Amino acid sequence: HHHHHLVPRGSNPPPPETSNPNKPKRQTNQLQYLLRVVLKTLWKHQFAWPFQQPVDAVKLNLPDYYKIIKTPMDMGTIKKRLENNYYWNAQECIQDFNTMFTNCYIYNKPGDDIVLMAEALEKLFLQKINELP
Numbered sequence: 801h802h803h804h805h806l807v808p809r810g811s812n813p814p815p816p817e818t819s820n821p822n823k824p825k826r827q828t829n830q831l832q833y834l835l836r837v838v839l840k841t842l843w844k845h846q847f848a849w850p851f852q853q854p855v856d857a858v859k860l861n862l863p864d865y866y867k868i869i870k871t872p873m874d875m876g877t878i879k880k881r882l883e884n885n886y887y888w889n890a891q892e893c894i895q896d897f898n899t900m901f902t903n904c905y906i907y908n909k910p911g912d913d914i915v916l917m918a919e920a921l922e923k924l925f926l927q928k929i930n931e932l933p
């Protein structure tokens with residue numbers, strides 16, 4: 801038999817939503833700070849790049865990534881959610897950051913370069929969180 805299962809291929813899943821008209825939303829002091837200070841300082845950091853977009857498991861040759869990580873999250877998605885006023889409160893946005901960091905610590909090994917990057921970003925995140933209004 802000449803079917804060698806070379807197709808169909810893998811793919812990335814659809815990315816998290818960044819819009820949802822029926823989701824409850826608010827603008828709050830805390831959410832404005834989350835965009836203007838928290839997200840924008842992490843985004844500009846030289847360790848941000850692995851976290852600036854949904855994980856492209858196809859490009860990165862990480863075929864196990866979406867087998868292990870079932871609640872993906874990234875700063876591109878968070879940025880867009882903040883820009884779109886998607887959240888109801890600060891907790892929803894903070895939880896997204898916490899999911900992103902937790903995913904990184906699940907997927908990778910302590911001491912890995914990616915983990916060193918997440919640790920540094922998480923330290924900065926926690927510092928900025930402490931000055932939330």
Ligand SMILES: COc1cc2c(cc1NS(=O)(=O)c1cc(Br)ccc1OC)OC(C)(C)C(=O)N2
Binds near residue numbers: 851862904
């Ligand atoms: C092993 O390659 C990677 C592992 C991760 C990763 C990216 C890669 N591949 S890579 O080419 O971006 C890469 C980044 C660093 Br830092 C070190 C080695 C890498 O690939 C070998 O980012 C995410 C998906 C957020 C992750 O949690 N882990």
